[PDB]
C-alpha cells in the first residue's frame, strides 16, 4: 500500500540502524501492513544532510541522522545542542520528549521535516593520557575537538583553547602524541581503540550524540490518519527501545575499555564548574540554533522538565 525509504549513515549493527528495524516492524505492525518501510543504510542514498533535503520535497520519507546535520537546513534543531543541557540519558529523554512538538513547530517550516522521536546515543566523554578530574587538571592540555563553535566556546570557557582538527587526523596525533586528548562517546573509544593511545576517562556531560528520526512533511500529510497516528507511534518506541540498546552498548563499551587498562574517573569532582562555565555561553548560540525567542523558550522547557 505505502512504501516508507528510510535513509541513514551507520553500518547495520549501529544503535541507529536497530532502532531503525524497529520502526520498521513497529510499522508494519500498526499498519496491519498497509505500510511498509525499506531501509537504506550506510549512506546509500546520500549524505545525511543531503537526504534531509529529498526529505523536505518527498524524495525520501524518512531518516535518522545526527542533529548536527540537520542544523543547517533547521537551525531550531540546534538546541539539542546547548552545552550542559542534560546531565544524564534520562533527564535528557525528558526534556527532549517535552521539546518534540514545539520543535516540531519549527523543524516542518525551515526544513519540510518533522520528528517522530529524538533518538540520542550517548554523551562526548573526555579521554587523555592523564587524570582530569577538575577543571585546573585541564590546564596545559591540548584537547582536540570537532571544528564547531559550541565545542570550541565551550572548552575555551573551561580554560584551555582546544584543537579544532579533523576526525581522520585524530588518531595519528595521539599517537605521535602531539595532542593530548579528545572527547566523543565511550563507544567511539572502542570502535577508534583509542585505550591504545590514552590512558583515561573523565564523563562530562556538555554534549550529546542526538539525532532525530524524522518523516517527511509531505509523505506524512498525504497519509490517511490511520497511516499518520501509526507512524507516530511506532517511531516514540523505536526510538524509546533505540534509546535503551544505546544505553546497554555503552556500558558494555565502558566494561571493555576498562579491561583495556583505561581509568574510568565517571563526572569530574568539581562538576558544578564545568556545567556553570558552560552555560552561561548560551545567549551566545541563540542565533544559530533559530533565534532567542525559540532558544529561550526551548531552554525553558528543558529546564521545567529538570
Known sequence: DYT????????ES????????????????YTEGKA?????????????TEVAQALRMGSIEAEILYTGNLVPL??????????YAYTSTEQAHKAMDALIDPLNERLTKEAGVRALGLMEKGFRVLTTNKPVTTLEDLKGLKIRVSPNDIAIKTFRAWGIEPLPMDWAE???????????????????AISSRFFEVQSDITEIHYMMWTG?????????????????????????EAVDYGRQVSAELTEQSKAELVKNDMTLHGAPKDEEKWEAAAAALWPEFYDQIGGEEWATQAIEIIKATE
Open 14 to 29: 549501529n544503535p541507529t540502524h536497530l532502532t531503525a528495524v524497529k520502526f520498521q516492524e513497529l510499522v508494519k505492525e
Open 36 to 48: 511498509e518501510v525499506q531501509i537504506f543504510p550506510s549512506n546509500s542514498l546520500g549524505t545525511e
Open 170 to 188: 585524530v588518531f595519528p596525533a595521539l599517537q605521535q602524541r602531539v595532542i593530548d586528548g579528545q572527547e566523543n562517546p565511550y563507544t567511539t
Open 4 to 11: 516508507i525509504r528510510l535513509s541513514h549513515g551507520d553500518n
Open 74 to 83: 533547521a537551525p531550531s534543531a540546534g538546541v539539542l545542542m546547548l552545552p
Open 212 to 236: 532525530p528520526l524524522l518523516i517527511s512533511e509531505r509523505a506524512f500529510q498525504k497519509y490517511p490518519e490511520d497511516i499518520q497516528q501509526a507512524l507516530l507511534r511506532a517511531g516514540r
